[PDB]
Design a protein around this ligand. Structure first.
Ligand SMILES: [Mg+2]
Ligand SMILES: [Mg+2]
Ligand SMILES: [Mg+2]
Ligand SMILES: [Mg+2]
Ligand SMILES: [Mg+2]
Ligand SMILES: [Mg+2]
Ligand SMILES: [Mg+2]
Ligand SMILES: [Mg+2]
Ligand SMILES: [Mg+2]
Ligand SMILES: [Mg+2]
Ligand SMILES: [Mg+2]
Ligand SMILES: [Mg+2]
Ligand SMILES: [Mg+2]
Ligand SMILES: [Mg+2]
Ligand SMILES: [Mg+2]
Ligand SMILES: [Mg+2]
Ligand SMILES: [Mg+2]
Ligand SMILES: [Mg+2]
Ligand SMILES: [Mg+2]
Ligand SMILES: [Mg+2]
Ligand SMILES: [Mg+2]
Ligand SMILES: [Mg+2]
Ligand SMILES: [Mg+2]
Ligand SMILES: [Mg+2]
Ligand SMILES: [Mg+2]
Ligand SMILES: [Mg+2]
Ligand SMILES: [Mg+2]
Ligand SMILES: [Mg+2]
Ligand SMILES: [Mg+2]
Ligand SMILES: [Mg+2]
Ligand SMILES: [Mg+2]
Ligand SMILES: [Mg+2]
Ligand SMILES: [Mg+2]
Ligand SMILES: [Mg+2]
Ligand SMILES: [Mg+2]
Ligand SMILES: [Mg+2]
Ligand SMILES: [Mg+2]
Ligand SMILES: [Mg+2]
Ligand SMILES: [Mg+2]
Ligand SMILES: [Mg+2]
Ligand SMILES: [Mg+2]
Ligand SMILES: [Mg+2]
Ligand SMILES: [Mg+2]
Ligand SMILES: [Mg+2]
Ligand SMILES: [Mg+2]
Ligand SMILES: [Mg+2]
Ligand SMILES: [Mg+2]
Ligand SMILES: [Mg+2]
Lengths: 134, 143, 259, 178, 60
RNA sequence: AGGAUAGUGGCCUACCAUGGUUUCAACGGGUAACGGGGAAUAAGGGUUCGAUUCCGGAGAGGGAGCCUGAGAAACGGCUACCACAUCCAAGGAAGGCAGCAGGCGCGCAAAUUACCCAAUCCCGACACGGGGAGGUAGUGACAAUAAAUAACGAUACAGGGCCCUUUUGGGUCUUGUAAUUGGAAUGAGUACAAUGUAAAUACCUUAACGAGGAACAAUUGGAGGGCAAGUCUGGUGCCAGCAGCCGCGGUAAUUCCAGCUCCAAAAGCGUAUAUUAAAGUUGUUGCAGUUAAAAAGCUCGUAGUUGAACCUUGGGCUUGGCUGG
């Protein structure tokens, strides 16, 4: 039925990045798979760590189901985790907000448009305004 | 002593003699002379497009008696004029004057086949549509 | 070609890094440094491919920018710094000291050493000559320049670097019977004693080396690194295997018994 | 760009397309082992044709040659491992005597039928293709999966299959649920 | 060669061939099943006429 | 000897000698020629190819000349000319996709004016910015791997297989026929969802849905020989057409056009061209030269090729490592 089983192998203690890192094996018979959010809750209880210090990613289910393999990180603190984590994983866990920027086309076009201006934008547009006597 | 040098230091004579004598192989001459590049109507290509000039018809060779129904085609790539056979029962009616036809060889690699005299190409497509598709009513000619 | 190359194609990287083909188009180009490009090991390969401490290239830069990594007693922040033979890597956060010595398979072994041994290093003397104001100096294999050496030290000798002051503790004269590791060619990583030095004026001198199993191989003098005063007395701890090359049949037999 | 990824062909066609002796031998051989097409017979012949070539090269070398001893024993060991070569025929002269039926015996399709889990060999392929057979604790749906000697004993129905203790399938649930 | 001829007879035989529709016959099995069908037909129920074996005997 | 160069050097200059290469093929021409690692085919020996994932070289429409800089004769730097070509208020100004995508043209011949720096790496004053380098997706039957398109029953009916048996008549278990009858199994597809990812798509897992004509319907070529498979039926009648080659067609065509049936390969099959084996039809291995193609009319002869035999043998002594047994 349920009976989610978690195995950790290739465990490496990494004080250089203030974390412990390992491979995660999940046994979930009679279950499609286990969500990363649910694995993070289970992992926090097993190792008595804060939920926000646990990161899992890169999961794949074996052929026939019933088993998945991934990678996990456990930091010594949430502060250490927030420093040594990719932005996209913190957005996954809700620890950060997705930064809002224009498309790459818009950013590149704006960069090349500003390349035609020497000096301040205020000077350039005031002088351009003077030329167009309209 | 078999009429060729055998000495251990006679490799130059052996190498040059073989090099000289491969020119007697007509297959070898055509590869190095680039005769397909220079003389072939296709310029060495497998296929070539062209424009149909006229529907005419070629009398078969003996002992056969028939009208092989061909077309006169001017190749787009070099402006040369060739005769191309139109295969199958009644496919000449699919080919009209000033149509664009894709040609290919007859498969004898530059020689005429069977009783058809002087024809080395066959029509594959007309107006960008396969002649076989037209024959089997899979597609219709765009006109 | 209008200037120096700055990229390294994945396929063109040194084979002893043991990089995979399909991970990307490029490989880490080692910076200019104490060791040659072909004979070095960038710190990015060591921290990610060897130790597997970092999961990607972004993480190795994060490790080194917090001042953790020291090479030869100095903090290095260059992710493509060309670490080489006899270099000491210190990670005091993990309390680990490594020395880069070749294993018998031709690759840089992951050779852990004690803190006491990590306080010095060996360098092969490339040349001895006079500098400005008539001051003699020695150039080691890692580009070090040591002034006022022992006047008995000559080329192809090995010096013991204090590695904290950069001075010479003592040296080993190049002569028959000295313990040697091979640092080039197909006999790379083997350890033995000098049997016979064959001189060739204007060409390349050849050294005959005897393995601990009385196997004899020949290699160029440029690939010879003196590491001990006699057999069984290396001046640094050797990696696992002690530089003795076994045949593939012998390796298969040893692997069968171990498993 | 990125380094090229290696690939190779796994079969080779006969030089003479129409030959009743070979055609009859192939169809007789395909019917016995329930093969889909002739390419599955060409595949066995191709890999057997290059096994013989490897064996011939070692046999020209002197006995006790290091290459002949190392690679010959490894090739024999691998063939014994998959059950194609008998334990009393490790001489590299019986390797040349191997036949395509030796390889077809060790397919998953052959072993399922020969283990009694299926009524016929054609039932074996559809059982395999339909994710009913598991080797160890791993479902295998490839009929050409070569069974090792140590994996031979662990062929049985998948634990989540209707025939092996799993729930009822799609068809039964639609009938008994009305 | 002298080359010319009337084009009026192009497609004569194919045009005047009486059109006959294909009878809506059962599909043949595909893949592994078809190899199974052929094997039995040639090695299980042999239809030989005392050493005279024909794949496509015309009715005679 | 000097000048110039970062530096050697006819690299250039002054003066002076007459040298330098070449039938062992110089020099010149051609190349549908960038070189190599390599590719195709392969008993051996070979033949053909290599624009193209790596290395080296060369170029940025064609030349030439330069600035800056350690590094460029750089071209997403400049100057000038040639060929194209843009705006103009007619005074002037500005160009270089053999970068990515895309367009025109050319052609037998080749994809999206998409997303992103998350990975691989590179650059900068740099832990932070940038990167059409690179990665992701789109198109994609270039090639390559695996691999569905059905499986099993039940009855019927037949034969063999056996057994009760002399055959007879039966019991009965192995095949084949069933518009002759069932209940099982599953993914293609779709889908909550989770995983995947920078974000997605897809894959992998997986609720619910998803197969009887299981229309969820395999095709491409052939059926005289080579070459496997029709002397079937209808049509035409040296016409139309087929036919790589040999050949077929003039009223029962084994060859055309069709229907049926059958053969071959099958998610692939056919055609054109090139190339390799077959080709011992380029032959060193390994061809042929009286008559099938082929000994110069005959001698001489330089280069080339090739060149008789002969100089410490035998014996003896110890001598290690191996291999029968
Ligand atoms: Mg700006
Ligand atoms: Mg600006
Ligand atoms: Mg000539
Ligand atoms: Mg040729
Ligand atoms: Mg004829
Ligand atoms: Mg066309
Ligand atoms: Mg240095
Ligand atoms: Mg140093
Ligand atoms: Mg047959
Ligand atoms: Mg001078
Ligand atoms: Mg000079
Ligand atoms: Mg060229
Ligand atoms: Mg070439
Ligand atoms: Mg190449
Ligand atoms: Mg090339
Ligand atoms: Mg070209
Ligand atoms: Mg290149
Ligand atoms: Mg350039
Ligand atoms: Mg251009
Ligand atoms: Mg330029
Ligand atoms: Mg450009
Ligand atoms: Mg450039
Ligand atoms: Mg472009
Ligand atoms: Mg294409
Ligand atoms: Mg396009
Ligand atoms: Mg990918
Ligand atoms: Mg289908
Ligand atoms: Mg779907
Ligand atoms: Mg879906
Ligand atoms: Mg997601
Ligand atoms: Mg057909
Ligand atoms: Mg036949
Ligand atoms: Mg008739
Ligand atoms: Mg023929
Ligand atoms: Mg008739
Ligand atoms: Mg008839
Ligand atoms: Mg017949
Ligand atoms: Mg025929
Ligand atoms: Mg027919
Ligand atoms: Mg078949
Ligand atoms: Mg050959
Ligand atoms: Mg001949
Ligand atoms: Mg001959
Ligand atoms: Mg002859
Ligand atoms: Mg001949
Ligand atoms: Mg004659
Ligand atoms: Mg004569
Ligand atoms: Mg002699």
């Amino acid at each position: 039925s349920d009976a989610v089983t978690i195995r950790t192998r290739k465990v490496i203690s990494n004080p250089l990045l203030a974390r412990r890192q390992f491979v995660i094996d999940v046994l979930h018979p009679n279950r499609a798979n286990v969500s990363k959010d649910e694995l993070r809750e289970k992992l926090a209880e097993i190792y008595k760590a804060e939920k926000d210090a646990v990161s899992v990613f890169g999961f794949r289910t074996q052929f026939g189901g019933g088993k998945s393999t991934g990678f996990g990180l456990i930091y010594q603190s949430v502060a250490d985790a927030k420093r040594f984590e990719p932005a996209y994983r913190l957005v996954r866990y809700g620890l950060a907000e997705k930064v809002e920027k224009a498309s790459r086309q818009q950013r590149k076009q704006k960069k090349n448009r500003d390349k035609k201006i020497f000096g301040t934008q205020r000077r350039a547009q005031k002088r351009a305004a003077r030329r167009n006597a309209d | 002593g078999k009429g060729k040098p055998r000495g251990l230091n006679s490799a130059r004579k052996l190498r040059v003699h073989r090099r000289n004598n491969r020119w007697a192989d007509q297959a070898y001459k055509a590869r190095l002379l680039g005769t397909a590049f220079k003389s072939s109507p296709f310029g060495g290509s497998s296929h070539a497009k062209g424009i149909v000039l006229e529907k005419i018809g070629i009398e078969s060779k003996q002992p056969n008696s028939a009208i092989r129904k061909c077309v006169r085609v001017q190749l787009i790539k070099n402006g040369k004029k060739v005769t191309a056979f139109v295969p199958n029962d009644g496919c000449l009616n699919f080919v009209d004057e000033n149509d664009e036809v894709l040609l290919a060889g007859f498969g004898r690699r530059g020689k005429a086949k069977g009783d058809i005299p002087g024809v080395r190409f066959k029509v594959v497509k007309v107006s960008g549509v396969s002649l076989l598709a037209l024959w089997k009513e899979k597609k219709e000619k765009p006109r | 070609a209008r200037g120096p190359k700055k990229h390294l194609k994945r396929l063109a990287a040194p084979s002893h890094w043991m990089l995979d083909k399909l991970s990307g188009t490029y490989a880490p180009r080692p910076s200019a440094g104490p060791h040659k490009l072909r004979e070095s090991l960038p710190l990015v390969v060591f921290l990610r491919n060897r130790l597997k401490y970092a999961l990607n290239g972004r993480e190795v830069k994060a490790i080194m920018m917090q001042q953790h990594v020291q090479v030869d007693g100095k903090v290095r922040t260059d992710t493509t710094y060309p670490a080489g033979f006899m270099d000491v890597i210190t990670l005091e956060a993990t309390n680990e000291h490594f020395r880069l010595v070749y294993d018998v398979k031709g690759k840089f072994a992951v050779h852990r050493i004690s803190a006491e041994e990590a306080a010095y290093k060996l360098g092969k003397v490339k040349k001895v000559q006079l500098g400005k104001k008539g001051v003699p100096y020695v150039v080691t294999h890692d580009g070090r320049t040591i002034r006022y050496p022992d006047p008995l030290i000559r080329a192809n000798d090995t010096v013991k670097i204090d590695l904290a002051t950069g001075k010479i503790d003592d040296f080993i004269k190049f002569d028959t019977g000295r313990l040697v590791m091979v640092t080039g060619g197909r006999n790379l990583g083997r350890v033995g004693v000098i049997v016979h030095r064959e001189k060739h004026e204007g060409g390349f001198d050849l050294v005959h080396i005897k393995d601990a199993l009385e196997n004899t191989f020949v290699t160029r003098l440029s690939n010879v690194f003196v590491i001990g005063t006699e057999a069984g007395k290396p001046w640094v701890s050797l990696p696992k295997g002690k530089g003795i090359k076994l045949s593939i049949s012998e390796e298969r037999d040893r692997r069968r018994a171990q498993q | 760009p990125r380094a090229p990824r290696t690939y190779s062909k796994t079969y080779s066609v006969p030089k003479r397309p129409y030959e009743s002796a070979r055609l009859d031998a192939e169809l007789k051989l395909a019917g016995e082992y329930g093969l889909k097409n002739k390419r599955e017979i060409y595949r066995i012949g191709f890999q057997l044709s290059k096994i013989r070539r490897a064996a011939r090269d070692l046999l020209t070398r002197d006995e006790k040659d290091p290459k002949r001893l190392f690679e010959g024993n490894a090739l024999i060991r691998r063939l014994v491992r998959i059950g194609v070569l008998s334990e009393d025929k490790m001489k590299l002269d019986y390797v040349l005597a191997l036949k395509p039926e030796d390889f077809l015996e060790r397919r998953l399709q052959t072993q399922v039928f020969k283990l009694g889990l299926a009524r016929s060999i054609h039932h074996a392929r559809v059982l395999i293709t339909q994710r009913h057979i598991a080797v160890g604790k791993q479902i295998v749906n490839i009929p050409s999966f070569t069974v090792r000697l140590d994996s031979q004993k662990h062929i049985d129905f998948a634990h989540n299959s209707p025939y092996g203790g799993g729930r009822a399938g799609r068809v039964k649930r639609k009938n008994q649920g009305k | 060669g002298k080359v010319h001829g009337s084009l009026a007879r192009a497609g004569k035989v194919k045009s005047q061939t009486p059109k006959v529709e294909k009878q809506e016959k059962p599909k043949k099995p595909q893949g592994r099943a078809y190899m199974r069908l052929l094997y039995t037909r040639r090695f299980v129920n042999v239809t030989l006429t005392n050493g005279k074996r024909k794949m496509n005997p015309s009715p005679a």
